[PDB]
Amino acid sequence: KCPAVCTCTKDNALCENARSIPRTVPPDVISLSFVRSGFTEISEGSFNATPSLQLLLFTSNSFDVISDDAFIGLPHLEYLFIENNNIKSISRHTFRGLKSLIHLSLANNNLQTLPKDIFKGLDSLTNVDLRGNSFNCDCKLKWLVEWLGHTNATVEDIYCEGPPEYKKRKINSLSSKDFDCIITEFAKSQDLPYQSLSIDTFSYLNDEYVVIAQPFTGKCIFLEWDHVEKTFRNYDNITGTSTVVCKPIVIETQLYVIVAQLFGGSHIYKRDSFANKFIKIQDIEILKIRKPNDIETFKIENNWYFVVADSSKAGFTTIYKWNGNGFYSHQSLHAWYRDTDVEYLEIVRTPQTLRTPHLILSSSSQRPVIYQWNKATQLFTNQTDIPNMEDVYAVKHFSVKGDVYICLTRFIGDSKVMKWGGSSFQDIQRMPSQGSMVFQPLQINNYQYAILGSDYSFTQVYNWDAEKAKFVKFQELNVQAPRSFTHVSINKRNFLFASSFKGNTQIYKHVIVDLS
Amino acid sequence: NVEEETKYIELMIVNDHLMFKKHRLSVVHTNTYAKSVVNMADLIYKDQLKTRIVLVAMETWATDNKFAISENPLITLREFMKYRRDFIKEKSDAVHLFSGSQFESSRSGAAYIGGICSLLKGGGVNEFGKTDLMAVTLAQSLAHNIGIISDKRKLASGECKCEDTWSGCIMGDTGYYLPKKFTQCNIEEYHDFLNSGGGACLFNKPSKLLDPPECGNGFIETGEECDCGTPAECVLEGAECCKKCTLTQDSQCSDGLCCKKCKFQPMGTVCREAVNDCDIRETCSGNSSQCAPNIHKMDGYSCDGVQGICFGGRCKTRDRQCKYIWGQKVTASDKYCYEKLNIEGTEKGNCGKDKDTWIQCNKRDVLCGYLLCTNIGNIPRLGELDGEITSTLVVQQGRTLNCSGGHVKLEEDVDLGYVEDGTPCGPQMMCLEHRCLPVASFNFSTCLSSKEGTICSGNGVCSNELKCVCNRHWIGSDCNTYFP
Numbered sequence A: 001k002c003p004a005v006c007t008c009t010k011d012n013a014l015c016e017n018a019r020s021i022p023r024t025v026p027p028d029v030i031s032l033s034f035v036r037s038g039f040t041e042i043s044e045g046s047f048n049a050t051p052s053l054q055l056l057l058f059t060s061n062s063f064d065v066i067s068d069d070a071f072i073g074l075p076h077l078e079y080l081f082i083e084n085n086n087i088k089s090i091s092r093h094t095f096r097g098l099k100s101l102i103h104l105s106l107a108n109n110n111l112q113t114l115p116k117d118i119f120k121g122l123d124s125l126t127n128v129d130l131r132g133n134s135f136n137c138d139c140k141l142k143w144l145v146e147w148l149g150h151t152n153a154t155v156e157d158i159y160c161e162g163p164p165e166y167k168k169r170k171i172n173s174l175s176s177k178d179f180d181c182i183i184t185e186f187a188k189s190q191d192l193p194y195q196s197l198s199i200d201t202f203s204y205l206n207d208e209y210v211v212i213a214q215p216f217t218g219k220c221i222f223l224e225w226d227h228v229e230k231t232f233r234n235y236d237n238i239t240g241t242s243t244v245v246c247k248p249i250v251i252e253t254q255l256y257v258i259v260a261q262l263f264g265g266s267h268i269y270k271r272d273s274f275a276n277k278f279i280k281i282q283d284i285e286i287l288k289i290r291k292p293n294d295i296e297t298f299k300i301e302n303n304w305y306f307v308v309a310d311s312s313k314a315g316f317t318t319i320y321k322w323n324g325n326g327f328y329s330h331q332s333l334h335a336w337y338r339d340t341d342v343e344y345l346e347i348v349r350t351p352q353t354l355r356t357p358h359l360i361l362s363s364s365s366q367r368p369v370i371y372q373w374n375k376a377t378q379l380f381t382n383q384t385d386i387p388n389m390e391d392v393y394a395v396k397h398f399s400v401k402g403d404v405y406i407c408l409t410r411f412i413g414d415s416k417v418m419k420w421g422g423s424s425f426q427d428i429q430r431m432p433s434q435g436s437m438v439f440q441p442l443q444i445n446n447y448q449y450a451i452l453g454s455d456y457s458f459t460q461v462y463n464w465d466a467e468k469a470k471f472v473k474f475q476e477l478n479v480q481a482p483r484s485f486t487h488v489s490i491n492k493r494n495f496l497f498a499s500s501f502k503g504n505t506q507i508y509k510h511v512i513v514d515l516s
Numbered sequence B: 001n002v003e004e005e006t007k008y009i010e011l012m013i014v015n016d017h018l019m020f021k022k023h024r025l026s027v028v029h030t031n032t033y034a035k036s037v038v039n040m041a042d043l044i045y046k047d048q049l050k051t052r053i054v055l056v057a058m059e060t061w062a063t064d065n066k067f068a069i070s071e072n073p074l075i076t077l078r079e080f081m082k083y084r085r086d087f088i089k090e091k092s093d094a095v096h097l098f099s100g101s102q103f104e105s106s107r108s109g110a111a112y113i114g115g116i117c118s119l120l121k122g123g124g125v126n127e128f129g130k131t132d133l134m135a136v137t138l139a140q141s142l143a144h145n146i147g148i149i150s151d152k153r154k155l156a157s158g159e160c161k162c163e164d165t166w167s168g169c170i171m172g173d174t175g176y177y178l179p180k181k182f183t184q185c186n187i188e189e190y191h192d193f194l195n196s197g198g199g200a201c202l203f204n205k206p207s208k209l210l211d212p213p214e215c216g217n218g219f220i221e222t223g224e225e226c227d228c229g230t231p232a233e234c235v236l237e238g239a240e241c242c243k244k245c246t247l248t249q250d251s252q253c254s255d256g257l258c259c260k261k262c263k264f265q266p267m268g269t270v271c272r273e274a275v276n277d278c279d280i281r282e283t284c285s286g287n288s289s290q291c292a293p294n295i296h297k298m299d300g301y302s303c304d305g306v307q308g309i310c311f312g313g314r315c316k317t318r319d320r321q322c323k324y325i326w327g328q329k330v331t332a333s334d335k336y337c338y339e340k341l342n343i344e345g346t347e348k349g350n351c352g353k354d355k356d357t358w359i360q361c362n363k364r365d366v367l368c369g370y371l372l373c374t375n376i377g378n379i380p381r382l383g384e385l386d387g388e389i390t391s392t393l394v395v396q397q398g399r400t401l402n403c404s405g406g407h408v409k410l411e412e413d414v415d416l417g418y419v420e421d422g423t424p425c426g427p428q429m430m431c432l433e434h435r436c437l438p439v440a441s442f443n444f445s446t447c448l449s450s451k452e453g454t455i456c457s458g459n460g461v462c463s464n465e466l467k468c469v470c471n472r473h474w475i476g477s478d479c480n481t482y483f484p
């Protein structure tokens, strides 16, 4: 029955001075105790063929590592005590496989660390005792701070023994602050030989593609993910002359690409599903649209629209509604001005608690104008202009929490962010730059960035500081003549596309070095 | 050759009150801004048209506008030229207005076509923009003054096309990307304007400039004995003559049309030959390095033989008017077509228009009525066609003659398609107000002549200055003294 190396009882057993766990236990034995055993390590997948255990304990042993799934084969296990040993590290999934565990004690073995979510998989837990360990409080203990507040199980208080700046401090008392475990970087991945004016992304049949407008070949370039090597490859082209903006619009699982050209341009294309080739559908009126500088896509109350900015005095900036078979003229705006950019944003306008669709378009040598959507007349009215800001090339918007901000691009002088107040934009941050043709906010994995491009100088990447409530200098990219910046998201992968007017286009990887 | 010669546009800029406010009511900021705009426009004209834009004077209004400014650029142009006629006394080839207001119109400016060096038509109107945009706006307005037109007919044909696809040419619609280059057809139109007798003034070289005088700029200024220009330009001509704008003691002639080997060309040497029937050959004074002021025959001289009369150095005929509006393939209709169609007073021909009424052309005055051209295309060269072209055929002496016309409007106030004033309907008769009137009626001034029944005694020709230009071997006030 019981091996003579270890003391036993009818319903109980106590083992001491053994280098290996006995292979066989009598069927009625339940609880097992190992004291000062010569174990080098726990056996991988140990405690097989001993299902009856309701309790187990180890004391005063020497364990360098406790392997994953060491406790599998114990469906009836409830109390687990591992304490008063010397242990350096244990694996995360060691406790995995026991959902019946009730009480657990890691106390007083002088553990300096624990792997994240070691306690995942035990949903029956009530009491846990970590006391007595020397706990270095760092990124490795951040998950444990998250776990202390979210667990219903009672846990006696434990203290930080390190780093010495935090000493005898309760791990329970810590909060989301006082932790910086994450930094971010943009590293160059691919270099595209062609120069580009604009880059855009779209999702067709749950597949995220990229459209790049190359001005000097007139081509509208399409890039698709390739799993075998680097994902970006060129799958298709649309041919045009002097293509400026290429805007894909997917409507009810049907792809439309609006491409603006400077030579007899402004054509609307659709993707034919069977042939999987782009087919010219409509031609935008050449008298209304002449020198388009921009295209903005937006959807309001289950209706799709797009608007083209005309920088010619003769042409008019025009919004095009979708009747379901195609795009047709809806409203002309800002007659006899030179329109460089159009921007759509939904902002709360006091008194209204609801957000309302708005337009912001930038006229050359003029102040930016804001249009409020009127639901009753289905038109933009109440033209209002951003005060004390002139020669704005473009306006882009981002939101932090509930508030919304805008990045205004001024080619000369300061380009500055502004926050939407009740009736107005208040000045927030002022950064001067030379030759800035783009100021682009980007949000990647809840990280707000602002990239400020420059021709004569370096492109300056900024990060949003929640505590400072302003953008902070972050990184400096080198790109020849940035006209645009686009965030591309593959599955769990993220990229940054940087257009270059006078040079080759840049593709940057989004790299996160992170610990817990 | 007139095309080879360098042409100089003396330009005066008038800044309205809104332009002054845009510059924060600073005289230095306004003057430096305008100077920058004119300098860039000068770069374009120097590169393309072999023409230099010189700023002779500038008038800025610190107080409120003298005349009410208008949203319509054509209306503002009329008021501005009205003001500049009655008020501005400064000498300039062209007077352009910089307006802080933005005109509501397809145009960013308005300028009279071929109006250069007219006191009434010599001006232009330009809306406020950035320095580069203002330079292009000034370039296209001055282009209209020097006779550069859109020429819609050849554009629709495709023969005339700006070969820059990304950015247009100057005369086209201006987007965010600005044009620096003129079309070749624009060049040909400018040269045709020069060859027809337009812009004679442009050949005068500016003596005084608004900017403080600098040596080596190519223009002589008070206190400057000579200017040969840039050292390379100096090496080409006038290197030995002129150094540091100081005449070398040996040689008082540095660089000029009448200047050769650093010595004055003898009197009577011909610097520039006449470009047409109306032009008069200029000759070297012998007292000046520059050639004599460009002059032309006085109004009323016969051009193209019998068919035409000279006005402003330019020949006015119905044929040239037809070829102007409807293109070079057109020719003037036969006189019978005028005679039969105009007397009818219908849409097909008339002496004029009244509200809800058509004016029957009087029997006496016909060739002064509705303009009829043999072969007419659908699209006019300039202006916009109103209505549809009118076509009527008449047969005289067993041969059918096709005679057509159209209503073409440059602006709402002035309507083309009617015979221009001054056309010779009949011998000693000029077309005026759709009527043939004896030349004596308006009493053209003539140059002095000793002999009766001759001009300038018969030894000379009358000029734009009303002075006799004598034939070789004849000299005098009246050209009546024999001096071989």
Ligand SMILES: *[C@@H]1O[C@H](CO)[C@@H](O)[C@H](O)[C@H]1NC(C)=O
Binding pocket: A152
């Ligand atoms: C865990 O907490 C939730 C509320 O946060 C409560 O509804 C639930 O009953 C608790 N479960 C246990 C086992 O205490």
Ligand SMILES: *[C@@H]1O[C@H](CO)[C@@H](O)[C@H](O)[C@H]1NC(C)=O
Binding pocket: A194, A214, A217, A219, A221, A234, A235, A236, A237
């Ligand atoms: C797409 O266009 C690029 C040049 O912009 C060209 O090199 C490439 O071959 C094209 N791909 C096609 C036509 O599939």
Ligand SMILES: *[C@@H]1O[C@H](CO)[C@@H](O)[C@H](O)[C@H]1NC(C)=O
Binding pocket: A374, A381, A382, A383
């Ligand atoms: C703005 O729109 C409101 C209706 O939404 C109207 O009553 C008001 O007169 C408008 N204001 C201007 C300046 O057009």
Ligand SMILES: *[C@@H]1O[C@H](CO)[C@@H](O)[C@H](O)[C@H]1NC(C)=O
Binding pocket: B287
């Ligand atoms: C030649 O010109 C000078 C001034 O340029 C003048 O003083 C002189 O009298 C002239 N000689 C003539 C006209 O014979």
Ligand SMILES: *[C@@H]1O[C@H](CO)[C@@H](O)[C@H](O)[C@H]1NC(C)=O
Binding pocket: B374, B375, B376, B389, B390, B391, B402, B403, B404
């Ligand atoms: C006569 O004029 C009409 C204008 O409508 C034109 O269509 C036709 O060709 C002309 N016939 C000629 C020039 O013989």
Ligand SMILES: *[C@@H]1O[C@H](CO)[C@@H](O)[C@H](O)[C@H]1NC(C)=O
Binding pocket: B441, B443
């Ligand atoms: C025209 O002027 C001349 C003098 O130059 C005069 O004799 C004649 O009467 C004038 N004619 C008219 C109609 O006034």
Ligand SMILES: [Ca+2]
Binding pocket: A294, A295, A296, A342, A343
């Ligand atoms: Ca946009």
Ligand SMILES: [Ca+2]
Binding pocket: B008, B009, B010, B093, B201, B202, B203, B204, B205
């Ligand atoms: Ca002149």
Ligand SMILES: [Ca+2]
Binding pocket: B213, B214, B215, B216, B217, B218, B219, B220, B221, B224, B226, B227, B245
């Ligand atoms: Ca000089």
Ligand SMILES: [Ca+2]
Binding pocket: B273, B274, B275, B279, B280, B281, B282, B294, B295, B296
């Ligand atoms: Ca002459």
